Amino acid sequence: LPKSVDWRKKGYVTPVKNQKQCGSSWAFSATGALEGQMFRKTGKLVSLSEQNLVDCSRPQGNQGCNGGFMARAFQYVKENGGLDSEESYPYVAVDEICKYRPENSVAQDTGFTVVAPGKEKALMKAVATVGPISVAMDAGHSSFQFYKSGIYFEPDCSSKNLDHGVLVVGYGFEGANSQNSKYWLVKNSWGPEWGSNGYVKIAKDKNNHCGIATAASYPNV
């Protein structure tokens, strides 16, 4: 595998978005993974509709602004036959009536692939070979809310109890040694202003920190 990967540098990632006051990180993580897969498939980067997911995926088990899961979102895209673009179905950060329009669909999936659980090595292979990957993590600490730069490492982080969906867009290391000070490049949905231009470097190969490899997946396009 490569020593480092950064899908942002290859055009697979949209600019950072902001979920605002709605517990929709699961939707942002899902559209991020679909955006990278549609880009790999067609060469066109199109921002997808998290609102489409928020308003319409209740049957698949999601709860809009009250929470959900990326796998349920990919299930909805598969069952629904499509997903609208953000331009056509804008994000408003509140639960609204489902307004899916098939004529406006710009993405599709036949289901999804799950990365072997808890395996950071399996996650690194998926990131290097597929593109950005949806992952769940434990973001429930003040150190994460206030993160600004460097490799994030929180001793109280759990690898089992997860509460926020994010997107792994790559991995790398600090310094000249490729085997130390390793990190996962993660795109968050708290706006460009949070963290490092909206991203966070999470410690890699340090016992699956914050559970990044615990429940990872990607849509099959």
Coordinates of C-alpha atoms in Angstrom, one line a residue:
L1 CA 0.0 0.0 0.0
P2 CA 1.1 3.6 -0.4
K3 CA 2.9 5.3 2.6
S4 CA 0.3 8.1 2.3
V5 CA -3.0 8.8 0.5
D6 CA -5.1 12.0 0.1
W7 CA -8.1 11.7 -2.1
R8 CA -8.7 15.5 -1.8
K9 CA -5.7 15.9 -4.1
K10 CA -7.3 13.7 -6.8
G11 CA -10.7 15.5 -6.9
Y12 CA -12.9 13.0 -5.1
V13 CA -13.9 15.3 -2.2
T14 CA -16.3 18.2 -2.0
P15 CA -15.6 21.3 0.2
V16 CA -16.4 20.9 3.9
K17 CA -20.0 21.2 4.8
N18 CA -21.8 22.1 8.0
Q19 CA -24.5 20.0 9.6
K20 CA -25.3 22.9 12.0
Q21 CA -27.9 22.1 14.7
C22 CA -29.0 18.8 13.4
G23 CA -27.7 15.4 14.3
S24 CA -27.1 14.4 10.7
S25 CA -23.4 13.5 10.6
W26 CA -24.4 10.1 9.4
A27 CA -25.9 11.8 6.3
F28 CA -22.8 13.8 5.6
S29 CA -20.6 10.8 6.0
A30 CA -22.8 8.9 3.6
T31 CA -22.9 11.6 0.9
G32 CA -19.1 12.1 1.3
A33 CA -18.5 8.4 0.5
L34 CA -21.0 8.5 -2.4
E35 CA -19.5 11.6 -3.8
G36 CA -16.1 10.0 -3.9
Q37 CA -17.5 6.8 -5.5
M38 CA -19.6 8.7 -8.2
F39 CA -16.4 10.7 -9.0
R40 CA -14.4 7.5 -9.4
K41 CA -17.2 6.1 -11.7
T42 CA -17.8 9.2 -13.8
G43 CA -15.1 11.8 -13.4
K44 CA -17.7 14.4 -12.2
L45 CA -17.7 15.7 -8.6
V46 CA -21.3 16.6 -7.6
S47 CA -22.4 17.7 -4.1
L48 CA -25.1 15.3 -2.9
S49 CA -28.2 15.9 -0.8
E50 CA -27.9 15.2 2.9
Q51 CA -31.4 16.7 3.2
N52 CA -32.7 14.0 0.9
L53 CA -31.4 11.5 3.4
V54 CA -32.7 13.3 6.4
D55 CA -36.2 13.6 5.1
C56 CA -36.6 10.4 3.4
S57 CA -34.8 7.6 5.1
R58 CA -37.0 7.0 8.0
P59 CA -38.2 3.6 6.7
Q60 CA -34.6 2.3 6.5
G61 CA -34.2 3.2 10.2
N62 CA -32.7 6.6 10.2
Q63 CA -34.1 9.4 12.4
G64 CA -33.2 12.5 10.6
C65 CA -31.9 15.2 12.9
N66 CA -32.1 12.8 15.7
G67 CA -29.5 10.4 14.3
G68 CA -28.9 7.6 12.0
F69 CA -26.3 5.4 10.2
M70 CA -24.4 5.5 7.0
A71 CA -25.3 1.9 6.2
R72 CA -29.0 2.7 6.5
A73 CA -28.4 5.7 4.2
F74 CA -26.8 3.5 1.6
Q75 CA -29.7 1.0 2.0
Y76 CA -32.1 3.9 1.3
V77 CA -30.2 4.9 -1.8
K78 CA -30.4 1.4 -3.1
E79 CA -34.0 0.9 -2.2
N80 CA -35.0 4.3 -3.6
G81 CA -33.2 4.0 -6.8
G82 CA -31.3 7.3 -6.5
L83 CA -30.4 10.4 -4.5
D84 CA -30.7 14.0 -5.4
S85 CA -28.0 16.6 -5.8
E86 CA -27.5 19.2 -3.0
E87 CA -28.4 22.0 -5.6
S88 CA -31.7 20.4 -6.3
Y89 CA -32.5 19.4 -2.7
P90 CA -30.8 21.9 -0.4
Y91 CA -29.7 21.3 3.2
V92 CA -31.7 23.2 5.8
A93 CA -30.8 21.4 9.0
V94 CA -34.2 20.4 10.2
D95 CA -36.5 17.5 9.5
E96 CA -38.8 18.3 6.6
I97 CA -41.2 16.5 4.2
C98 CA -39.6 14.1 1.8
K99 CA -39.3 15.6 -1.5
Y100 CA -37.2 13.2 -3.5
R101 CA -37.4 13.8 -7.2
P102 CA -36.1 11.0 -9.4
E103 CA -35.5 13.4 -12.3
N104 CA -32.9 15.1 -10.1
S105 CA -31.0 12.0 -9.1
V106 CA -27.3 12.2 -9.7
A107 CA -26.2 9.0 -7.7
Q108 CA -27.1 5.4 -7.2
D109 CA -25.8 2.4 -5.2
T110 CA -26.5 -1.3 -5.2
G111 CA -25.8 -1.6 -1.6
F112 CA -22.6 -1.3 0.3
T113 CA -19.4 -3.1 1.5
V114 CA -18.4 -3.3 5.1
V115 CA -14.7 -3.1 6.1
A116 CA -13.7 -5.9 8.5
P117 CA -14.5 -4.6 11.9
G118 CA -11.9 -3.2 14.2
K119 CA -9.2 -3.8 11.6
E120 CA -7.1 -0.7 11.0
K121 CA -5.1 -2.6 8.4
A122 CA -8.3 -3.5 6.6
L123 CA -9.3 0.2 6.7
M124 CA -6.0 1.3 5.3
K125 CA -6.5 -1.1 2.4
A126 CA -10.0 0.2 1.7
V127 CA -8.8 3.8 1.8
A128 CA -5.9 3.1 -0.6
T129 CA -7.9 1.1 -3.1
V130 CA -11.5 2.4 -3.1
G131 CA -11.5 6.1 -2.2
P132 CA -13.0 7.9 0.8
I133 CA -14.6 5.6 3.4
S134 CA -17.5 6.3 5.8
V135 CA -16.6 5.6 9.4
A136 CA -18.1 6.0 12.8
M137 CA -16.1 7.4 15.7
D138 CA -16.3 8.5 19.3
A139 CA -16.4 12.3 19.0
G140 CA -17.9 12.9 22.4
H141 CA -15.1 14.8 24.1
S142 CA -14.2 18.4 24.6
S143 CA -10.8 17.9 23.1
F144 CA -12.5 16.9 19.8
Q145 CA -14.9 19.8 19.9
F146 CA -12.0 22.2 20.5
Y147 CA -9.5 20.5 18.1
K148 CA -7.3 22.9 16.1
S149 CA -4.3 21.1 14.7
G150 CA -1.8 18.1 14.9
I151 CA -2.5 14.5 15.5
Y152 CA -5.5 14.1 17.6
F153 CA -5.2 11.5 20.5
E154 CA -7.6 11.4 23.4
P155 CA -7.0 8.9 26.1
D156 CA -10.6 8.7 27.0
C157 CA -11.7 7.8 23.5
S158 CA -13.7 4.6 23.0
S159 CA -13.3 2.1 20.1
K160 CA -16.7 0.6 20.9
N161 CA -19.1 3.3 21.8
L162 CA -19.5 5.5 18.7
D163 CA -21.6 8.6 18.2
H164 CA -20.6 10.5 15.1
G165 CA -20.1 9.7 11.4
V166 CA -17.1 11.1 9.5
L167 CA -15.2 10.4 6.3
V168 CA -11.7 9.1 6.0
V169 CA -10.2 10.7 2.9
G170 CA -6.6 9.5 3.4
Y171 CA -3.8 8.7 5.8
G172 CA -0.3 9.8 6.3
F173 CA 2.5 10.5 8.7
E174 CA 4.5 13.3 10.2
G175 CA 8.3 13.6 9.7
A176 CA 10.5 11.3 7.5
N177 CA 9.7 8.0 9.0
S178 CA 6.6 6.5 7.4
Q179 CA 6.0 4.2 10.3
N180 CA 5.6 6.6 13.2
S181 CA 3.4 9.6 14.0
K182 CA 0.8 8.0 11.7
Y183 CA -2.7 9.5 11.2
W184 CA -6.0 9.1 9.4
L185 CA -7.0 12.2 7.4
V186 CA -10.7 12.8 8.4
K187 CA -13.3 15.2 6.9
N188 CA -15.8 16.4 9.5
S189 CA -19.2 18.1 8.9
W190 CA -18.8 21.0 11.4
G191 CA -17.8 23.5 8.8
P192 CA -14.5 24.8 7.4
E193 CA -14.0 26.8 10.5
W194 CA -13.7 23.8 12.8
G195 CA -10.4 22.1 13.3
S196 CA -7.9 22.3 10.5
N197 CA -9.9 23.7 7.6
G198 CA -12.6 21.3 8.7
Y199 CA -10.4 18.2 8.9
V200 CA -8.7 16.4 11.7
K201 CA -5.7 14.0 11.7
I202 CA -6.7 11.1 14.0
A203 CA -3.9 8.9 15.4
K204 CA -3.5 5.8 13.2
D205 CA -2.4 2.3 14.2
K206 CA -2.7 3.2 17.8
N207 CA -5.2 0.5 18.8
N208 CA -8.0 1.7 16.5
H209 CA -8.3 5.1 18.2
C210 CA -11.8 6.5 18.7
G211 CA -13.0 3.4 16.8
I212 CA -12.3 4.6 13.3
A213 CA -12.1 1.1 12.0
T214 CA -15.0 -0.3 14.0
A215 CA -17.8 0.3 11.6
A216 CA -16.5 1.4 8.3
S217 CA -18.2 1.1 5.0
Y218 CA -18.5 2.3 1.4
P219 CA -21.3 2.3 -1.2
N220 CA -21.1 0.0 -4.2
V221 CA -21.8 2.2 -7.3

